[PDB]
Structures are given as structure tokens and as C-alpha cells.
Structure 1
Amino acid sequence: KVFGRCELAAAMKRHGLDNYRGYSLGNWVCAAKFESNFNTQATNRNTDGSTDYGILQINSRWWCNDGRTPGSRNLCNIPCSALLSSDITASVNCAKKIVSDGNGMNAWVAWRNRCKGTDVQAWIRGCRL
């Protein structure tokens, strides 16, 4: 499915992402906009054999198992296919592990390039959560 901005903000807040590991809710909403365009089914292949999956474009080299990526670590202990569900639970649970790895939200390339340093509160503005 394709989330609306405030719809995703609400869902992400219900799933405990607001201020998680020091990152306010707008960071997560912005990340999702630029990672997947709010589409839970977005996938993108990479040069190293990996693929990024779902609303938060979680990578199969480190985080989820897709059975076709070399050097896979499956640190979220989740099949990548589960991260393409319209329900964001598996993606959020994995994201929480990723952001806890010791480099914050920098693992999200689109967040790093297009969200970090901007006023991310704007992403939840008007949502009255």
C-alpha cells in the first residue's frame, strides 16, 4: 500500500518510533518518503548483490534474509519478504535494531542525504497526532 504522510506518522507513532534512540517522529516519516515514496512494496537492487526492501528500504546484506545475497548476516532475523507487508510492524521492529547499531539513522542513505539537517518536524506538522 501507499501511505499518506499523516497516516504513516500515526502508524509509526503507534509503533513507538517517535524519539526512538533519539530520533523524533519526523525523521522517520521523512526517511520513508525519500526511501520508498511511502510504498510498502518498494524494492531496489544494489551493486553488491543486495536488495533494499519496503517502506524503509531495509538492506538484505546486513539486516534481512532474502536467500540471494552474499555475505548476508540477517541481523534482524527476518525474511526480507515479510518487510513487504502492508502492515509496517516487521519493518519498524527491524528499523529499531538498525538505528541501535551504533550509527543512528545514517544507514538510511535517503534520510542521510535529503532529511538530515532539514526541519523534519515539518513532516508531522498538521497531523495532530
Structure 2
Amino acid sequence: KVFGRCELAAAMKRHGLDNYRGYSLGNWVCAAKFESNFNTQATNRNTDGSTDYGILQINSRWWCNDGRTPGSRNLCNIPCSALLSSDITASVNCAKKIVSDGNGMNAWVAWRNRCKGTDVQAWIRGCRL
């Protein structure tokens, strides 16, 4: 599913991302825009042989099992395919683990490079929330 901006903001709010670890909802919608273009089906293979999955491009090196990233972990205890569902529950739950790990939203390269330090409330402007 390719979400609209406000549709994603609502879904993310409902699943408890707004202000999760102190990151306002705009930061999560921004991250999703630049990680996946709001596409739950997005996949991108990394140089190390891991792959990033879903709306928040969660990586198989640490977070989900894809059956082809040897010696990786599965901290979210999910198949990576779960992160590609139209239902973002799995992705959000796993993002909460990630952002809690120590590095905050710097775990998302697109967030660091395109959202951090920017006016992220823009991403939730106009939305009914």
C-alpha cells in the first residue's frame, strides 16, 4: 500500500508513534516519506547483504528475519515480510524498538539527512489528528 501523507500520519498516531521517545509525529512521517515514499512494499538491498523492508526501511541485519542475511539478528521477532504489509502495526512496533536502542531516529539514514533539524511539523500540517 502506498499511503497518503495524512493517512500515514493517522495510522502512525493510532499505533502510538506520536512523541514516542520524544519524536513528534512529523519526524516519523518525514522518515517514512524519504525511506520508502510511503510505500509499505518497499525493499532495498544493502552492500552487506542485508535488506531494508517496509514503510520505515527496517534492516534484516538486526531487526527481522529474511532467511538470507547470515549471522544477523531478529530483534523484533518478525519475518521481514511482515514489514511489507498494508497494516503498519509490525513496522511501527519494530520502529519503537529501534528508536529505543540508543541512537534514537539516527537509525534511519533518511531521517538524519532529510528530517533531523528541519521543520518536521510540516509533514502533519492539514491532517485531521
> Following TM superposition, by how much is the alpha carbon of 1:44 offset from its aligned partner in structure 2, in angstroms?
0.1
> Following TM superposition, by how much is the alpha carbon of 1:43 offset from its aligned partner in structure 2, in angstroms?
0.2
> Following TM superposition, by how much is the alpha carbon of 1:128 offset from its aligned partner in structure 2, in angstroms?
2.6
CA distance in 1, matches of 2:118, 2:70: 35
CA distance in 1, matches of 2:101, 2:70: 21
Q: Which structure 2 residue ranges, 5 or more long, are not aligned?
A: none
Deviations 1:16-72 (A, max 9, x none): 000001100000000000000000000000000100000000000010000100221
Identity %: 100
CA distance in 2, matches of 1:56, 1:100: 15
> Following TM superposition, by how much is the alpha carbon of 1:11 offset from its aligned partner in structure 2, in angstroms?
0.5
TM-score (norm 2): 0.98
CA distance in 2, matches of 1:5, 1:41: 16
> Following TM superposition, by how much is the alpha carbon of 1:6 offset from its aligned partner in structure 2, in angstroms?
0.4
The aligned length equals 129
> Following TM superposition, by how much is the alpha carbon of 1:86 offset from its aligned partner in structure 2, in angstroms?
0.5
Q: Which structure 1 residue ranges, 5 or more long, are not aligned?
A: none
Q: CA RMSD in A?
A: 0.6
Helix, strand or coil at the partner of 2:10: helix
Deviations 1:97-119 (A, max 9, x none): 00000110001011111110100
Helix, strand or coil at the partner of 1:47: coil
The answer for the alignment partner of 2:80 in structure 1 is 80
Q: Any runs of at least 4 consecutive aligned residues in structure 1 with deviations exceeding 4 A, and if so which?
A: none
